[model samples]
Target: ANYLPLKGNMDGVFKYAVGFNPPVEDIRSRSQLLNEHKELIGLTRVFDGSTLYVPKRICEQRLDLMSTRQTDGASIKVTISLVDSVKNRDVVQLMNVIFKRILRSLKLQRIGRDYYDANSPLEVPQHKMQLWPGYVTAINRHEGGLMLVLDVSHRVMKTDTALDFLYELYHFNQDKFREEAFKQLVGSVVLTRYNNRTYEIDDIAWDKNPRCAFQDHAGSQITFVDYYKRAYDLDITDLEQPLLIHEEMVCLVPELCAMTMKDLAVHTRVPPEKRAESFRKFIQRLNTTKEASELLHSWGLVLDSRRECLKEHVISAVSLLDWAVLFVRKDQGKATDFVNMLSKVCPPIGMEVHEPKMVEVVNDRTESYLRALRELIAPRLQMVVIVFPTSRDDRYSAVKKLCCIESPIPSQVLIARTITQQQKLRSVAQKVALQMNAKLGGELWAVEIPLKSCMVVGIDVYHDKSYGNKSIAGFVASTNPSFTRWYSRTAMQEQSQELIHELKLCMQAALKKYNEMNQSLPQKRITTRIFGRSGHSYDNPPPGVIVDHTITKSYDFYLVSQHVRQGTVSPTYYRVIYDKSGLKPDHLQRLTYKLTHMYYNWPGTIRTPAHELSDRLFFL
Candidate 1:
């Protein structure tokens, strides 16, 4: 009779072996023993009536006759061979070959029996018997060859678990069987040992398309094998897709299953065991349904798109690096040689070296180079001042007050012995001027100059007491216009030399110009005598143009002193209180008002003390 294919649920074909004395303690040990004696042993004995044997060498070999078995009311014969040369191939490889051949042969047979010829009545057996094949095969040729054959008879029951099935397969052809079985068993054990706590699955749908037995429950059908393969095979760029899938599964499946199970359990009203079984079956069916297939397909598409996006991003990143190199070279005036040098120093793709020391060295060099360039473009200047305190001997307090005024003198100054009492007085004057500017709402400039010649003062007054006779220094600056820029180089340089020089020149020029301009005016005798010699008028041409000697000789001291006392001079001004109220006399409020006044008044010579005022009021 032509072989008829077995259809419907084949779960019945799988049987849990009973009274079968396993050769070794566990599946792993049995597999090892099988492998050890693979070449010498004919076959391993399985409890089932059917005897299975493999060729000594899998490729194109016939089974040994002794491996066949016949017993009381039961007998079975089977042979397996690899069409490919898989003599020393692994167990999984051998199994693949064997299953592949078996499945192919079974498919070739007709679905149902034909040509039974029952009319002849040759006295066929009372029990109807059928031959069925359940196996799998690889489509592509492997290392050894193809066409591995496995035969099974319907009389004997097949073990349900994969481990037991493996044992039976091993017994069929001990030599090849043992080798492959042991390898597979050991590999499995190692894997399980590492992930013993992990959950495992029996089967999964690997194909992306929706054409498989468990298609409906494809998402839940994920097995350890599938996870392992996917994880190991993933490209570095596809790292995030797996994580996303895992997250999606967590959100969708478990909650759905729980809700379904609860509803089924409450609504079914069947026996507990039957209800549980029904629920399980329902879940299984649901998972395997078309909906599940669609869900899996959607998920796969999402993952694929994400992976593609990641790949594109990586490519863009690489291009960005190239662009950065080009941009840096163009902007920084560095040659491409540096980029090539860097690439040479570092490892190629997929490898990187971290050298913090080298990075630091490079940074240091760059900073130094930039600093040098800055210095080349700009030069620094220093200012100096000389103070003479003895000139105002009796009016020491007035002298001190004058010296305290902020002026455009150098940061350092020399003062006579009499002026030493004004220690830190210059700093105080600056603070006062700052306060005045804040109150006045305008700029204010102040300066103090002594006409005394060279003299020494005690350094201890200024916090440096090592020397007995140290020069008393005068400090000068302006808060009215806190910043100043001199357009004329000669004036700036000369003014910076010493306060004496600055005072002398400014006074002389002012007096000379005043005389020159007003000389034509009919001035009273008293005014002329008090003002002394007239110099060239600024409004008209000079008469005879002789240098005004008298004006030049003593104008510096007179003009500077007059500006300080009268408070009319605009060059250096301070805020004066126009309105004062409240009996408490708020010093801080008063100070602020004065500062603002100074800031607004002397807009040219000084700057608004907004910064210092803020610091004093808030930060201090």
Candidate 2:
């Protein structure tokens, strides 16, 4: 194997088998959970905005400053292969040193039995390193590979900002760990015992998209570093710095930094079982509140306080089944009481503001339930509500991941155990109403697109696996001059890396929606992603200037570092990948900045119509 660790004793090495988890389900980050307790979410404790973009070597050159904790924080570095935590002497000593440094840096205590409790009074226990609550220094699995997870504690100034916690962690280590960039592994690393020897291996994606996967590694694979050296001599100097930086930090909104919906669920007094959907409502309200808007503006989001995108529009809903039938499992009759709770909910979310006629019955499986919805209601009913006993898995396989896939329109999905309280149902109903209106073509947020006939197209691609499910190509385009309302469509293919399986065909459908919503056609308007790697590195001439046009011909591309107010900045890559509009360089640069402000979610300007982005657009 091209990747192999030095041999060592390897039996029962891990202290816990279920590290943080199947990294996929580890959606709730352990680092944020720890930092949240110390009030480090929005604060830039260890590293502030000004130096946040400093190159790795610079930070590494000054580890004294980089390692200092604003809240006393930073993660442990994996310098070499880690082995038995307590069993192996070398592994134990090395990790202990790093942990002691991290603990001292973050000024955090270790948690033992519970997340809230940390009692490690033993003079010399089997291990000595520990993190704050909700953080575990355990080995976890991703895409099936094991990885080590060591999080930093927190301490930052009063206004330290964080665009994304994960992005920050990855970016903070990018330059310092750039040497490891040559290594071919993806995700975090973990030590495992195989053939009586402990070897550190690449952690897998677990459930999400598998990066740097071996989906087709059929031969002896060389390390990416070695591969690049041999194939491209592709010196680091040649690899564009813009490709290495984290642009999300510059674009992610302040609300995300404020607090997450999941965080609210944990702090609230609601029962754990029902809080998931109950607090889901809080997310909806929080996003639309005046205070929330003002708070985001304070963070430099620049809200369009003059316009409320959701207000003034009276949208009435017709059950796409006026008589909605709810199917539950006969074996699991727990939903009997909760089904009655729907009467109070359907009225507020509704057809003529009237409640859907709901009836409940028991079924053994989902297939039978779906069949009942299909034939029983046929075309008469406007809505279908399903009371699921096991949305994840209960022996009966579900036909659609979402009911909308099977049904022609919106269908409310509710859990049987969650509706134990009436308020929870009301919260669910409010959020569901928003989804219902959007599916029927209601504008969630609206803003004017820049320039006439110049359409700003945001394209995103999705893949199920490296070599598994076909890729899904999706794009959203403006349907109005304000560019507030958008028409989105998706298409999939049997191939991967295929940019939009037939762009022309897909573009036709998107344009048809544009015309239906208004009256116009779009030739195009253009441009823009990032890495931890900097506008600080590039000496950009005025927002838009030809840097290396000789690199390509037809669609000349320029990289711009549009710095904003906060302690953050991003490198915006403007490539006229396809510019049929024949836009002047100045106009395109201005257009790009104006286009940034056109998003409807926040009625804010991204570029003053051209200083820079407001709360910014994390274009995911």
Candidate 3:
């Protein structure tokens, strides 16, 4: 009877016997042999591929192979004798090592069958059956004889038997495995080299250079040291001190520092009575210090003890002189004591004092001093001007004059009428700059001032009753005769009052609309009006005469008109106007909207109404 092949698909069975192969021939057969029936077979070569193949019948007949296989007929029994069990412990350890190597090489983890079920309670089906546990085995049998079996499962081993199996697989493909290992080694080396190089450079030059040329003075240096210590700590070694000092010096002299100092002084603790005295003492100490004296001398200051009074007195005199000069420059000619008393208080510091270069140096210093002073004085002036107009008027006529020139072109004429109006103009200018473009260019536009011309005409009528009526009536009647016939003395005054009331209402309406659109108050209203001269009308100017009607109004109208024009002025193009006085705020708003709409969609001006136009002008 022929033996049947052993077969069963079992979990871990293939892994257990992954590298197992049966010997096909015995070494005792060295010569050819002839069978009793005259059939002959030659001696087999062990390493030959042909000799490795086992026929199905022969494999089925092998008792050992059949025992290891998981066929239903196959059976394996493990009996533990005390001596054998002790030896099995070492065998189990070796088995674990082999399996772990195999699993790692396959990039597989030997997770428990219930591992996924525990981690994903919702994912596992409760009704699913669990796999049966069994050790791997191979069976063999002689033809028509009893079978032999061997159990080979290594899961009970302490070390990874899978890994040993994997080692064999790796050796089977040695070239590819070694190549991957080499690549990983090279990548680690390259990354380490780059990290070291970057750190070395950063350590060398991070804070070495001073920001400004004149920042080495004693007071400034102390401020620098304090700041450096706060950032990097004062306990740094002497070798690192110069770089930290340089960084601090740069920060102290930045353009932003002047403003920061003004804010600090408001909260600083120097007592009113002790402030000057304390400052004087500080300067004296600084002057007497060797480092301070040496640095000052390098900057061309003389510090001879014989020629001057006490060190503190000399230092106080120098500081006072410096303060006076700064104050005068900042006040813009309002304070002249420094220039007037320079020779008596503090002489020039060095031989260069008589040179032209000295004058340039002084001028540059004065410019910086003035700039800082202006920043200091501006907020207080703005607050007072905004609240008490009468006080501002008495003290600031020169300021008003300057404002008339500086107020945005659209509103200059309107604000020039009175100091109070000029203050309003300044406020409006600031608002426009903040809300509208904030940028430097745009077309001129105007806001419409309703009935403004009619009101002015009424004032003329009231002043020159008879003669003014004829001239004004001629101008009005020429435009529309019905308007002229409707005007009477009583009607003119009433109309004038009505027009004023309407203008105030219009301003309020515009302001409301602006705030609704912007979600904030309108800083100012800018208006621009564009007109073409009529060729054949008696009231029309001669050809080529582009008239700005705003010029004909009082300072109030002129100022409003200037703001309107500024709202629309384009930075890229140039426009020369014969007069810009006729523009109004309403006209400016309409024109600006139109231009912004056109350019943003077509040729594409970088400016867009959504972002560039004042939010105040939008009505919700």
Candidate 4:
């Protein structure tokens, strides 16, 4: 009675076995059971003191836990039972325990929730390419019952070690090796081969060598060379080689650890078909494994061999009109071509452009542009389009702060190179026009919302650069039901206060703007989504597929709104914590999907667009 008839993106009908009790009621601590029988619990199954869950087919429907006695004559007990269905969040947690244990048995290293296979890395010839294939598995209760969500993940590892990097850097600049090495390698992560553990490169201890001694467990001092030889039967060749500090604390030998590259490698951009084929191969291997199949079946779990179909509604695009541009000139040569291209391209897209009010500055410095805007800016100006000679972060931030915070206006900052490109100028100008119109409180497209006066608002938090310690909360609220015209505001938070309390003031200010524009207060109902924007794989789910179940434990849904041409598509997660719109599940879900199509900067769709209205595109 309390469920929505919403379709799921994947079919997951896992029939988990019913939990049972131990045979003789030998009560024991959950920790003690796991500690004593680490291999037994992990290899066989799991239990939570009050209930036990394991294989139904093993022995006479029960495992004699006391068969291998590790205790002081204390007998342990365990029993199992199979069932058709058991739907509870707690049961899914138990299922994950077994799944993780299964992964551990495969000789995979557990890094939090993911397990990476380090021994046999998939090798590509180019650039000595090496990618460790891994699995990110989780068991969750979804709209289609319990589902084991698995994705084929990869970790790129550089063939060269930190020791190799030091050699390369030293040769690259014999005298300045230390300076250059610190810049390149300081913050990167390195993976140790022996223990399969990752450690961040905090600093290089040039003075400490492999022969340097450190106190061990028995309070006996031992050198790195002696320690590795005694513990792992490994020898350290370079006793003179310096130690690499791990996060400013522990010292590690560079030879044993390999650098984990953070490159969006050329090989990573595999086509969709090949990516899907690779993911399918991974799943087939898991399904074919006897241990995997039996363990899952014994636990009464089954994966549906079909993808769940969904119904989606694509919102119609609305044209923007009556927006004027204010241009701040830097280079006249590029401005002529850009304005000409913008005029020609904007007309076909329903953006009516007129002669822009031009203001030429004497110099192209950040101060010069800010000074011009401060003087020329007026209530009459619709959009400010600033042309920069060079694209620099400080220069961009200065102009944005002046226009967006000090004197609020919809401003678009452009570079000279973007306009000079002859082949891409038409498309560039089209996007520029769309951005200008959106900046000037114009709508590009909208989804179907039958309600008349409900206001939809998006709030996102940001930390200011100049005031690094302070927080900035950006608020954007729609003035009308059309979800086009908006009142964007930012609240500067001192020290750090309650987000809801500060947002209350932000909404109050937006309501005044709503009243002024419509001459009527919006329906006392407001649908506000706090945009805390900040993930994967297989063929990557199709664009617009909404995963409303599984994965999420609360009233949140994951949406894959944008389609990536290569590799995996990252879906944006939105949490609808509190909703007063009184709309049905489908209506709200469909409306959220529709909003993604309206971000004017992107031609197709964006990850999330509810917070796209404001001048500062903070989330994106």
Give per-model TM-scores.
0.12, 0.37, 0.13, 0.69
Name the best candidate (by TM-score): 4
Instruction: In model 2, state the lDDT of residue 603.
Output: 38
lDDT of 1 by residue, 1-620 (tens): 01111111211111111122233222332233223233443323222212122324333423322121112212222233223233233333333333223223222221221111111122222222222222111212211222211111122111132333433654678667645544543323111111122222222112222111121223455543344333233212222111101101211111001100223223322221222343244224323556433432321211110001111111001111111211111123221222333233223211122211111011222233233322322112211112332234333323233222333211222234322334534333333223222222222232222111111111111224445222233212221122111111012212223756654444343333334533421110111001213442211111111222343222111111111111112111123223343322233222322333332223221212231122132211
lDDT of all predictions, in order shown?
0.25, 0.37, 0.24, 0.56
Cα RMSDs of all predictions?
43.1, 22.7, 40.9, 10.4
- lDDT of candidate 2 at residue 202, scale 0 to 100: 34
- After superposition, candidate 1 runs with Cα above 4 Å error: 1-43, 46-191, 194-336, 339-620
Off by over 4 Å in 3: 1-584, 600-620
Per candidate, the number of residue pairs that clash is: 55, 43, 94, 0
Model 4: worst 10 consecutive residues (lDDT sum):
523-532
Could you give candidate 3's per-residue lDDT for residues 347-433 as a string of tens digits?
321101111111101232323322443344332121111111123333233333333233321111112223223434433332222
Deviation from native of the Cα of residue 288 in model 4, angstroms: 3.6
Q: Would you give me the overall lDDT of model 1?
A: 0.25
| Candidate 4 residue pairs in clash (backbone atoms < 3 Å) | none
Error of 3 at 140 (Å): 99
